Paper text:
Substitution of Lys51 with alanine induced notable structural rearrangements within the active site region, and these changes are not strictly equivalent in the two protein chains. In chain A, the absence of Lys51 affects the position and conformational state of Lys138 in the metal coordination sphere. The side chain of Lys138 adopts two alternative conformations: one rotamer moves away from the metal cation and forms H-bonds with the Oε atom of Gln54 and the Oγ atom of Ser48, while the other rotamer maintains its typical conformation, pointing toward the Zn2+ cation. Furthermore, both the zinc cation and the coordinated water molecule are only partially present in the mutant crystal structure, with a refined occupancy of 0.5. The Ser48 side chain has a slightly different position depending on the protein chain, without the characteristic pattern of three closely spaced water molecules. In protein chain B, Ser48 retains its typical conformation, pointing toward the water molecule in the metal coordination sphere; however, the interaction with the Oγ atom of Ser80 is no longer possible. As observed in the previously described S48A mutant structure, a sulfate ion (at 0.5 occupancy) from the crystallization solution appears in the active site area, forming H-bonds with the Nη atom of Arg47, the main-chain N atoms of Gly188 and Cys189, and one or more water molecules, depending on the protein chain. Structural analysis and careful inspection of the electron density maps revealed the presence of an unintended, second mutation at position 238, where His was expected. Thus, the crystal structure of the K51A mutant discussed in this work actually corresponds to the double K51A/H238Y mutant. The Lys51 residue from the Ser48-Lys51 tandem, with its side chain unprotonated at the high pH (9.0) of the catalytic reaction, acts as a base for proton abstraction from Ser48 and participates in the proton shuttling network during the catalytic process. The K51A mutein is incapable of L-asparagine hydrolysis because the Lys51 side chain can no longer play the role of the nucleophilic activator.
Residue numbers in the entry:
A (entry chain A): 3 to 352
B (entry chain B): -3 to 352, 358 to 367
The structure:
């Protein structure tokens, strides 16, 4: 495994360096390109949300609630707690006849500094309905209600809804139950850990299912649900994160060519639909990308993800230039002087 | 394998339920009053931007500027020269009092405003829609001292912050001399407050602080000192007596220095460097030196929360502190990992190994 770093400098002098791991996999999960240790055991955190959305959508009876594509995107989200995410959360609660008091997630400072500053000015204390995970929680309420399971402990590991989540994660990873480890996330759900390349496998299967759907293929019910999830994220990326957020600007820039998702502590995953770019990389199908910054730095994650799309030729220069402020973050001091930059001395191995 | 551990494996690590979340490479040097390396983590000579952990050397360059003594700066003013302060009202007030002492105005500052280094101060700013200005800079005390030096020598206050200005020529020389380095062995960038900022091997940052602490020792014992040594001792005394000017309420540097009640001074450098100067004590003697001691730390990826955890762990391993004094730092030592429903999800640990084994075990500094 290579010593792959992203490095920041001040006047050419090394400031910080961050170890990068990355996996690029085809639709079956075969490893195509790598940085660092592409199989590093990694907490997927909220980059697992589409698999959790799959578990929700595959639960008997959930279809009768009439969740729409923006609802599903919110199930996939780490949203910024904008008023529009709160509103959709309440509208999802109304659809399943539940109440904010039924949520088992808690409030937290918004993932958007601008939202949080507006909260601070107004003395606003976030509650359960503000959780960046509030959409997947409503979905898990919905699933528990759907099969009659009882709603108080829908978040606990021994509840049938978390059993479905756990089975669904392992099946998407093509792992045995024993090879996925579990802790607890900030929103109080079980959260999985598995080799980094398998996170890319999940998103390659999202993008693969989307390709099979627009191609009129016989699809399994699971493939069709994955296709729907892809479609929902790509259509409502503002629900997946929010205004000014990397995930939203990425997906907006690519206009349905890919879906992408943040994991807390600096994981990222992308599913890329089949394209001239994927074919040039040497695969006849969809593509998956997963990334982990070893030390957890988000600013460096987004810089590295954007540099990696460039290395991979994914997008056009014009399309990627929408992400320019993430690719080379601003390094400007309190008097407007540029003090340094970011570098990418890493080499993608194939 | 505990019998093949290497500096490349010196890490501080967070976990979720025992599953590794993040890991951060640790570099540290522990040196005696002459800079002799006593203990190390990672690469103790890593070329490193000291950032505002260099501030006591800039304060020294200010105080050794002929004619500055006539302004009547007091020990709290000097502590503020050594500061990365929280932009509390008292820090802003002292900045304006220092401007008045040298007959200058806020428009003479060449630093700019920025969100407070204190979350609580920043919250009050956000409520009031307050836009911070030059006089709010965490470096304002330093900048005023540089204005004072430029005035005292007749240099001209426009440009005091630029490398070619004699005040910055004084800084650059003073820094190299404290590190015992030739000029070509210190590199220079520009910091957030718009001053030249130095980079030199990590151990030399410990060297500067060992020299602060040593000078304090000599002054307190009544030894005849050079003008420089007496000035170092004054800087030490100022930081240790007014630690709230060096940082602010709730800040690590202030809580560290209050807890130790004069036994040491310590200072943050941005992007996760730390420096501590320790007066001679039973603890330093058990560590095997007959004088003062300096410590310098760098988290490679720049994480501050991990910095404070690591510095506190390292003080415990060095036997510096009592569990009682060091217990005021307990929230820094083991950062809370509690989710939005009050459940603890994980923790920090310190898989690093202080060195200073089989002779065939190479200690390749990395
Ligand atoms: Zn969550
Ligand atoms: Zn400064």
């Amino acid at each position: 495994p290579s010593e792959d770093f992203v490095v920041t400098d001040r006047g050419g002098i090394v400031e910080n360096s961050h170890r990068v791991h990355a996996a690029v996999v085809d639709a079956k999960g075969r490893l195509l390109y790598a940085l660092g240790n592409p199989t590093r055991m990694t907490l997927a955190r909220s980059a697992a949300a589409p698999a959790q959305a799959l578990a929700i959508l595959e639960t008997e009876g959930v279809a009768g609630y009439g969740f729409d594509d923006a609802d599903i995107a919110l199930m996939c989200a780490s949203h910024s707690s904008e008023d529009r995410h709160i509103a959709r959360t309440r509208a999802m609660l109304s659809k399943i006849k539940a109440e904010e008091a039924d949520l088992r997630c808690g409030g937290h400072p918004s993932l958007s500094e601008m939202v949080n500053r507006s909260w601070i000015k107004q003395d606003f204390i976030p509650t359960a309905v503000c959780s960046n995970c509030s959409g997947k929680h409503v979905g898990m309420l919905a699933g528990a209600r759907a099969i009659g399971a009882g709603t108080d402990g829908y978040h606990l590991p021994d509840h049938p809804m978390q059993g479905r989540v756990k089975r669904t994660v392992a099946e998407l990873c093509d792992l045995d139950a024993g090879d996925v480890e579990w802790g607890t996330d900030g929103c109080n759900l079980p959260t999985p850990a598995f080799p980094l390349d398998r996170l890319g496998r999940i998103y390659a299967k999202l993008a693969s299912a989307a390709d099979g759907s627009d191609a009129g293929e016989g699809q399994s019910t699971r493939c069709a649900a994955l296709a729907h999830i892809f479609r929902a994220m790509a259509r409502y990326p503002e629900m997946v994160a929010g205004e000014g957020r990397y995930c939203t600007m990425l997906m907006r820039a690519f206009d349905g060519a890919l879906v992408g998702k943040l994991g807390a502590d600096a994981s990222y995953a992308i599913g890329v639909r089949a394209s001239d770019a994927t074919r040039q990389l040497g695969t006849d199908g969809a593509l998956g990308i997963s990334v982990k910054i070893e030390d957890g730095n988000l600013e460096m994650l987004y810089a590295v993800v954007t540099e990696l799309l460039e290395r991979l030729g994914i997008g056009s220069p014009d399309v990627r230039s929408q992400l320019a402020s993430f690719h080379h973050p601003q390094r400007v001091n309190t008097m407007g002087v540029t003090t340094g930059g970011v570098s990418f001395p890493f080499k993608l191995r194939g």
